[PDB]
Ligand binder design. Structure first.
Ligand SMILES: CC(C)(Oc1ccc(Cl)cc1)C(=O)Nc1cccc(-c2csc(C(=N)N)c2)c1
Ligand SMILES: CC(C)(Oc1ccc(Cl)cc1)C(=O)Nc1cccc(-c2csc(C(=N)N)c2)c1
Lengths: 5, 236, 236, 5
């Protein structure tokens, strides 16, 4: 999965 | 409110204790209680709220993906009929996730966003609103799926418009909003080119503003900039 | 019973799904439902039950230790009075842990142990009973603390007596029982010498029986034997 | 902590 914050 | 009888300050203190104990459902319940006291939230309190629910829903999303993968295989051509159990349990987790998202979206609508006037609060909350409609979109399949996606987009867009007018390009809230809106484009809106363009432009404009920052602000900004680069590396 | 309307087999299937999704509270609730159907449990089902509750209570114990450490520091000579919040929240976690232990002990008493006739089931359940009284003992401070400790000891002792009569020294249930009863001696009963003697004798008698085992049984037994050695290394 | 199973 891609990074999110 | 089950927290209605506890002092606001005690709820915040116990949210911090729950975090140290890795009890994120408790942390979220305590912060929901603090929000429901009706006062605006400080910067630290906004992040306690966000951290708590991001951890709770993150675990639910992880579980939902495991179960959805099992379900998809159970429905393949050649598999042995396992009965309704996998679908039922995926639906159970999905319903609990939707409930958490609805709760967070409810706090934002009643009445965190309407009282948020400063860019740092208002952008933060609108990013959250986009994030939790994004999580709803990840599991959506019904008549209102496109409306859910557009609700995420609309919230992210309002946050972006404010952030570009009122925050420097290195502001970590601006950067994290752009990171997540870029993931929205890639994973939800079927717009990989928009996702890549947003991440690249955000990274480059931040790079050019780093010279204005202290060492501590530089650390904060470059941390998020590296997540933008990580995603670009995944996508190109 | 909230699980009273679900089929036993569906509850077992969903316990396995919950495990894959790392949803151990759900796994425990499903296995509690399966136990409450009233039929004896197979070997696999006994381990699903144990795995679920060990994970749930393990997280609670970890949280309780974090909070107890914070509380102890908050009460030191020189600390700033934080108010009742740390104690209150430690008590909240403690009460939830005690509730989980009482639930497991209730399942064992109604009526898993009384119907368990084979060594592999009866020793397994009596070990569990010792384990969950041990967890109660870890947080106990009242009039009945010594009774809680003796309840753990009594359960472990009955399990040990059966295991020595009915199982080979390499049986992994016998080994795990001895591992945990040894930790009971060390951490709960203030008997480090008994803890060390039990771990060493268990290890040596297992070592001498390994020659009788297949490769797969050997792997199972040596795995637990290494935990015994690890504890001995910690304690000597 | 010591190991238990
Ligand atoms: C993930 C990370 C590194 O950066 C982010 C960047 C943008 C957004 Cl919108 C969100 C996150 C972060 O968490 N940043 C951060 C910044 C400022 C205060 C806090 C904080 C205060 S109290 C607290 C606590 N966990 N008790 C955490 C945390
Ligand atoms: C921890 C470990 C390695 O050894 C133990 C040794 C003694 C005791 Cl009393 C307890 C544990 C273990 O877990 N052993 C084991 C043995 C036999 C079946 C299973 C099992 C069947 S289903 C399942 C599942 N997680 N779905 C797990 C597991």
């Amino acid at each position: 999965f891609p990074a999110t914050v | 409110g089950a927290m209605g009888s506890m002092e606001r300050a005690s709820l915040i203190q116990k949210a911090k204790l729950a975090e140290q104990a890795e009890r994120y459902e408790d942390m979220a319940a305590f912060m929901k209680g603090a929000v429901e006291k009706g006062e605006e939230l400080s910067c630290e309190e906004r992040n306690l709220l966000s951290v708590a629910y991001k951890n709770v829903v993150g675990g639910q999303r992880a579980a939902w993906r495991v179960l959805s993968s099992i379900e998809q295989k159970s429905n393949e051509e050649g598999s042995e009929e396992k009965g309704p159990e996998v679908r039922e349990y995926r639906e159970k987790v999905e319903t609990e996730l939707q409930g958490v998202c609805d709760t967070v979206l409810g706090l934002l609508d009643s009445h965190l966003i309407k009282e948020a006037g400063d860019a740092e609060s208002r952008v933060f909350y609108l990013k959250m609103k986009g994030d939790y409609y994004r999580y709803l979109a990840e599991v959506a399949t019904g008549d209102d799926k496109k409306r859910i996606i557009d609700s995420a987009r609309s919230a992210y867009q309002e946050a972006m418009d404010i952030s570009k007018k009122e925050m420097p390009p290195t502001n970590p809230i601006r950067l994290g909003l752009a990171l997540n809106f870029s993931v929205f484009h890639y994973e939800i809106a079927n717009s990989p080119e928009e996702a890549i363009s947003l991440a690249k432009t955000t990274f480059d404009e931040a790079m050019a503003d780093l010279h204005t920052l202290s060492e501590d602000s530089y650390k904060d900004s470059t941390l998020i900039m590296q997540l933008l680069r990580d995603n670009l590396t995944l996508w190109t």
